[model samples]
Target: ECSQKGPVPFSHCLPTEKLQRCEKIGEGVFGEVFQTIADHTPVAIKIIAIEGPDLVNGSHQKTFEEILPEIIISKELSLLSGEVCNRTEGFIGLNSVHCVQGSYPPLLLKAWDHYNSTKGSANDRPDFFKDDQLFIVLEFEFGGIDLEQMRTKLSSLATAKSILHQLTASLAVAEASLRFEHRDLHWGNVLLKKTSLKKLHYTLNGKSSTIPSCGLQVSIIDYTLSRLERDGIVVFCDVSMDEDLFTGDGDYQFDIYRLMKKENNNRWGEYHPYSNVLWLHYLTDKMLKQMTFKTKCNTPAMKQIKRKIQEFHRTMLNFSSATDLLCQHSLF
Candidate 1:
């Protein structure tokens, strides 16, 4: 029943007719994602349809009001990267937001068509949209590939070690402030890109810390299932009402939701920071079991990493929040 409180034609912002390239990269429950160049910078644009009669991906589309929480989360998380007391660049950088009206941009649709054939898109075709449709176009810094794609490329335990600590530290910083719960953090939601920097920095609860970058930078994305507090109010999606979300089981990722429901007692609105630990739990197990390491199968170095990840998973649940768990081990 809600749509973008949109402004201007979609073509005006993206200028589809003059565009040289707009490539559809992926599609999810809400809409299509495209990789394109904007102002000489490579960017990923996510276009969402809303306020339409037809269900999108079998779910009702969000209103402009409903989507503000997601936009807010990205902005606050981005600013945390530079903040003094609690900081990390573990969140995707959102460059801009545009609310536009009209049919899907011609170039974007063409790109979608290309993806439909090449990647076999799962969502409905964009050609079905009408000229009166509304879209919230978000432009973000290209956040590299999802971690699922990096399994074969990971060469050592050190980098994978860095990824977990880096992820935990980042979550710790945010958990300190917003009591942020990512709610859904499957391996696919963790994004990774190669980096040359030897170290990564974070400031947690006024304390400075550093960890080896391990030639990789990790970024967290997909906040659709996130919950956080700002001022006197808490914002969260009422996922507890969606029975189907917890019943399915193809991957261990599904179990996280079930456990989360139990932890929160089926009330999705409260602040339950231990939910962060539950996700870290899944990640630790995934890293130990699923990841690829070119090193020998039984090297002492590999065993040490396996031990650390195992120990972390074991003690993770005792902490009151990610912040406390991060401080317990002293990641430096």
Candidate 2:
């Protein structure tokens, strides 16, 4: 019930019927996403057109072979929430994958149009799909907004640390278990959702522990550029030819990409966990320099937070990888 469960008929999971159309929530060069529900549980459906002859977002339409690695990586990371030695719910809560053949569903087309009218979508329209088009539908727990849209959820420095710590632990777990590297972990790719719990739990190397949640949980998404090993096989995106990916300037996010390119020396297939550390450096710098704080500037907790953030900013590059950072985690 959690996966392909064998190929499914397109009509069985169409947005208008089984999935119950909600609204467009997110979009990427690879797919269009919609918020939906089943059995009263919120779900996000990422519908990606595959096996097509034309491009959707200026890139070649991916084939089943091209998308299989992405499917494997996503499901592997999602299963980390229940891993024996290291676990964290920081990765997106992937629920299932459905391979269906059909034209774009009318309800979802309307949803996409509505979203585009309001958000001004940049991807090519979905209206051009042929009747026999194939789409890989990924259903997941509805992830919340990115950091740019963050407001009350990120109220203070302590809360900010909670997000940083959770992601750090999750990154470490992924490295330990899957030899994973989220090659692209920009701010827009990290999702945050509200929760009532005051703390969240994690287990790394058989040691159980928890971090303060501050009523928010972080979910890292977008594995289109991720790399991982499973069943003695390595799966990764070949971004070596993506010249534009390394040309961006000015933002810390773009800088990380260039650093990643440098670390891997333009080849992306090898296991370079330090690339993961590069992303952490960007996060530490971003939290220190970009994010706003609501907590008073003179409080003791605020002072402690400032000192810790500074410490991380100063020493972030000293650590080699997420697991290494976890082994010597002074802040988490």
User: Which has the greatest TM-score?
Assistant: 2
Off by over 4 Å in 1: 1-6, 17-19, 330-332
In model 2, the runs with Cα more than 4 Å from the true position are 1-9, 15-20
lDDT of 2 by residue, 112-210 (tens): 889999888879888888778888988888778987677434788887788888888899988888899998888888888888888898888788888
lDDT of 1: 0.81
Q: Per-residue lDDT of 176-208 in model 1, one digit per residue for the tens?
A: 877799998888888888888889899988888
Clashing pairs in 2: none
TM-score result, candidate 2? 0.93
Candidate that would win on lDDT: 2
TM-score of each: 0.93, 0.93
- lDDT for each of the candidates? 0.81, 0.82
